[PDB]
Design a protein around this ligand. Structure first.
Ligand SMILES: Nc1ncnc2c1ncn2[C@@H]1O[C@H](COP(=O)(O)OP(=O)(O)NP(=O)(O)O)[C@@H](O)[C@H]1O
Ligand SMILES: Nc1ncnc2c1ncn2[C@@H]1O[C@H](COP(=O)(O)OP(=O)(O)NP(=O)(O)O)[C@@H](O)[C@H]1O
Ligand SMILES: N[C@@H](Cc1ccccc1)C(=O)O
Ligand SMILES: [K+]
Ligand SMILES: [K+]
Ligand SMILES: [K+]
Ligand SMILES: [Mg+2]
Ligand SMILES: [Mg+2]
Ligand SMILES: [Mg+2]
Ligand SMILES: [Mg+2]
Ligand SMILES: [Mg+2]
Ligand SMILES: [Mg+2]
Ligand SMILES: [Mg+2]
Ligand SMILES: [Mg+2]
Lengths: 369, 371, 362, 364
């Protein structure tokens, strides 16, 4: 029985709090200094936010205000949650310091026509569940919802490895303590899960598990811990793709780890959007102090409507893949990163990310003329 | 040109300092309480070690002593380096059949093995690990007294049309050193006593690029200029990006965490399959459901190197491995202090230490399943 | 020119007192299992944070996190609406493994033989706290402060009470007029002696106004930054140690307790109306090398003769003081708020007047 | 019975003084750009750690990390030798952004030219000398952390009769034996600073009686802002309202009125209106002027107490705002006070140590 599970987490999850803080600080600095170099880790545990890293910028930023404001947007805005943007400890250890690649790295991109956003079905549905739960909290539709939430979607795959059905949805949400489990369960199933899962993939055997922990009143960093870059699979493709092993949040586009991974997605997505494959993993190899990627591999899983060598050729001709090139190409020296630090860097329908534009379709179509 | 790069890092790298501390605390507790539940993150920056997490144990452990002792073994001792086990800040924020123990995460875990190396690991990650382990051994036995703990290796292997390892294209190796040694000496010494001591001669040619400390001088390192966190070397810890990920991290977690135990089990499978000659390579894929001991689903990718059916191989695995969380713990004897040693130079492919999930003692069981 | 003198006291809830009580709660925890425990434990508290740091040497097993969080809960920080909570705040722990002057003071201004300003300040903070904790006033929150200005006559006798300033943390659902009338009636008028009050006595309750979030939230607190509050409200001189976080091995603490024990017994015996006792220790000499005494000419006896009675009736060696006052017991958390001296509400050995007959007889 | 009195001072290197200097270095940094800067900055220091925390409200842009690490380097913790280092130690920062019915006491006494009690003054002079000798490189084996305790013997009339005991403990490189440490401190520090006319063959000199002392600063110990208040003031000769100075801008009457109280005491005694005086200021909530001024001359008054209080009300602006203008306190002048005493300073120029109100008081 071919079953595959992917997870996503809300803005409220401690690991995502860390990622959003790291990227909020990045935005704050790019907002004043497009040239800002940034390398900012965040750690969060019971009542604590430690920010630490190197930075090099002309920008003047009140880190405390950025951290506390980020935590408030997420929804931690009164002490009944245990965690509060105004009342939590914030400790800061920042150093201040004011082409060609710096890492001998591998970066991977992926796309697949399983969903309109060209993402695998499990990660895409997980993301849509966390984004819906969050929207329902924030617009005030469900007043008892608290920030921290998690979804795991198990999809059952065919003989052809096509998505046959949805086997299990696990969804856990933080809530006000004045709401009983039966209400939380019925409400999530009805207004979150059944609002987002396509009806044609559900049957009477689909398992819906809401808050299997039971009550979940105190959350965020309170019982738990959270760190920058511990939701890499959530951040990318839910484990459909390979990894060079950087993490994104807290890093400016100077970091090819981040910029080439965005570029790799841009390629994969345009290839599949153009119909040149049903799925493709793009593999970029950089050498230290060589701008151009030293090597480009491509895996279509034999869904390629074109040669592998011919596809690699189209990509070398229509994408600038030098670190500097990618920055100009995707316009990455702008404060666009806080919004990526929850609900996935890839497959985003709710916000406009440059590497999700399908504006290289005509360029690629034309390359076979 | 089909090129593929993997990195490994020394005990001295800040991310690995974090991983070793988290797992040193785990060992300390298992050493007194095999039943110890542990979830311990570590963060390290300039002169600082923050330890934080949940724990539940009958053990009495001096966390400060464990952290400072771990940092000293790594080699940060007697105040030379700017990071020191005796002199650094340490802050601690700690909270306080075999069927019916089912899984807690609705997770995916992956295992991998490939006959590219005797340890049955991909060539890039394996060589990277061997370089960091050699540099470390040479420091610690005192063969090269000017070496400092923090070091990094990136090995680029060139693959032919059939994706077989053709040659070694580039080795990048950066090491921390005493400031009284010039770059030319560092470079010639690393090339001769580390790289040429470890890279198989038959994969080297006059076009192999050796870049040692391409940044230049590297005197202050560890957490000093940098930052390090538990579970930010997951690719280093596993298969150098040859395999897929459910997205746990290992260090700081007791074997109660199926994220860790099933990943160990998945390697044990993959390695025994390939060791038995039932494939040249296999990725093993385990799917667990919340509160179901048995994996709900097992997939297997041989890349058409399978000497046996996929359905028949999955069958042999279900018959010869206990894959219940509790089962894996008994099977691999995981309630022992065996984890500090995994937190640098890879969890997989280890020839220098004895890890249960690296034993090839299920070969005859699997061979026998096809006669 | 009006001879006015002001002293302040602060509640368990004040951030500096939170620090002092945590440091001393950890000390008690260890003495409770190991009377020989050596302890030197500083605490710092700011927005949502408690850093504990210091040296310790003990056979005791103590969960520091549990001690810190339990201390903070007793103080009354027990739900997140206060901003500060024993369950939800950050707790960081950094625990490793004198040629001095000390001063004592006593004065017959109050039955406890303390200066009137510090004594009244302490009684106000102790009453406000009792009223919160027994649930008499449900809208009170932990953090509170009192400043009592006493007017002194010619002869420097307490003539009247000029001003009482009292500021308390409260639930936000209670109006200022209610807070003021309630504190005046159930705290101030319950504690200030009527014979020292007149129609000119100024009562200022929460002159800042509303005060809903407090403790370490807006502020900062450190171990040993309420030394004047802890002692005699500025009537006395200081060698300049602080008490909380230190076992009785620290002569800074033990000799200061001993100095009070002397002063109090001298004045209780009627040998003076007031006395400051001054103890000088030399490094590696058990006995104090020198004892001075200032009666402010209220001495019923010679200074040299009084010093003589003290040398004859008190063991003043560090070891001696520990045995004499039985100081290797967990009795210190109690002292870390509402004053080390003049305590009628708890039993401290250095407040016993059991050496009166010994000094009368001399 | 022998009337003996001991005061201590500590070096820049002592952990409590490291905390005080960091808190005041941050204050200076902000006043340097914003004279109007409101500041309330605590520092804590333990093994390899500096936590900075407090409220602040300023137009100034300050790299706190750079200020902390630079302060620690001046103190002498500079090249990874000592186990505490300005470049290698942890620095954590928790600063919030916002852009008293008190007693304060002053004291002066003609026991020393600076008009300070002899014990605290001599203690300060020993720590300042030990520090100068380290920093100018005269004694290369000295390390930052050091402590002095001076016991003075007093007469029946409480006049300084002699110096009974000097205790001085210094941190040192481990390659130097105790006999060298002792002879060097006695010769180049103690005998360089103690007035010969107060020494006799009974004067006890104890140098490093503890023994070896190679690791110090915050390493084995802990240090906090405002735990050297007696050292910072008058060595226990005076009374205390119970503020601490370092980390606080002059907006804090705790600090500004204490400076003002010293300014008064010193000018009174400098004018010869008394041999010693303790000045006592009482402030009431919402009254700029001190509500009450007491004065204790210990019967050394050459004038009435009521007449002296009158001269003080007529010649000093004692309103919080008044004191700031009077002593020009909205300037970066505070880092220098955070070691070797706020009062009696001969080596630096502090406004509250000027004796420029003598003629005003003489004339009254
Ligand atoms: N001047 C230098 N020259 C060379 N190497 C250095 C220098 N300074 C630091 N390093 C090393 O480079 C490391 C950073 O590499 P890396 O492993 O990428 O860091 P990371 O903090 O784990 N981030 P990332 O891999 O991008 O997700 C440091 O931890 C040191 O090991
Ligand atoms: N004490 C708790 N009570 C209730 N729910 C909790 C508690 N602790 C954790 N959780 C929930 O479980 C989540 C942690 O699970 P997970 O997403 O695996 O995070 P992680 O362990 O921080 N990261 P990783 O190891 O990289 O997979 C929390 O964010 C909550 O959703
Ligand atoms: N006019 C007084 C001086 C004086 C000054 C101050 C106070 C009292 C008196 C004589 O001559
Ligand atoms: K966690
Ligand atoms: K880093
Ligand atoms: K101290
Ligand atoms: Mg985590
Ligand atoms: Mg990287
Ligand atoms: Mg890192
Ligand atoms: Mg998980
Ligand atoms: Mg304070
Ligand atoms: Mg002292
Ligand atoms: Mg101390
Ligand atoms: Mg005050």
């Amino acid at each position: 029985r071919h079953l595959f599970t992917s997870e996503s987490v809300s803005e409220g999850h401690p690991d995502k709090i860390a990622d959003q803080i790291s990227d909020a600080i990045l935005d704050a600095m790019l907002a004043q200094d497009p040239q800002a170099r940034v390398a900012v880790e965040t750690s969060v545990t019971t009542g604590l936010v430690l920010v630490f890293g190197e930075v090099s910028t002309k920008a003047y930023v009140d880190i405390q205000k950025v951290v506390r404001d980020t935590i408030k947007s997420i929804g931690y805005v009164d002490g009944q949650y245990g965690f509060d943007g105004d009342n939590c400890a914030v400790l800061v250890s920042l150093d201040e310091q004011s082409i060609g690649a710096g890492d001998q790295g591998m970066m991977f991109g992926y796309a697949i026509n399983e969903t309109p956003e060209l993402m695998p079905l499990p990660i895409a549905l997980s993301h849509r569940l966390m984004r819906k739960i969050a929207a329902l909290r924030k617009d005030g539709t469900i007043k008892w919802l608290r920030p921290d939430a998690k979804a795991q979607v198990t999809v059952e795959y065919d003989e052809d490895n096509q998505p046959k059905r949805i086997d299990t949805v696990v969804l856990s949400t933080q809530h006000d303590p004045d709401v009983d489990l039966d209400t939380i369960r019925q409400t999530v199933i009805d207004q979150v899960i059944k609002a987002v899962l396509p009806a044609d993939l559900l049957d009477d055997q689909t398992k819906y598990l809401v808050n299997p922990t039971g009550r979940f009143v105190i959350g965020g960093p309170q019982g738990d811990a959270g760190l920058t870059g511990r939701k890499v699979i959530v951040d990318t493709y839910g484990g459909f793709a390979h990894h060079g092993g950087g993490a994104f949040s807290g890093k400016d586009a100077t970091k090819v780890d981040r910029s080439a991974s965005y570029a790799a997605r841009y390629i994969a997505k345009n290839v599949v959007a153009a119909g040149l494959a049903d799925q493709v993993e793009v593999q970029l190899a950089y050498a230290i102090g060589v701008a151009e990627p030293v090597s480009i591999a491509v895996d279509t899983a034999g869904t390629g409507k074109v040669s592998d060598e011919a596809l690699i050729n189209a990509i070398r001709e229509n994408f600038d893949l030098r670190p500097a090139g990618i920055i100009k190409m995707l316009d990455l020296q702008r404060p666009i990163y806080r919004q990526t630090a929850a609900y996935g860097h890839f497959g985003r329908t709710d916000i406009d990310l440059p590497w999700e534009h399908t504006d290289k379709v005509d360029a690629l179509k034309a390359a076979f003329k």
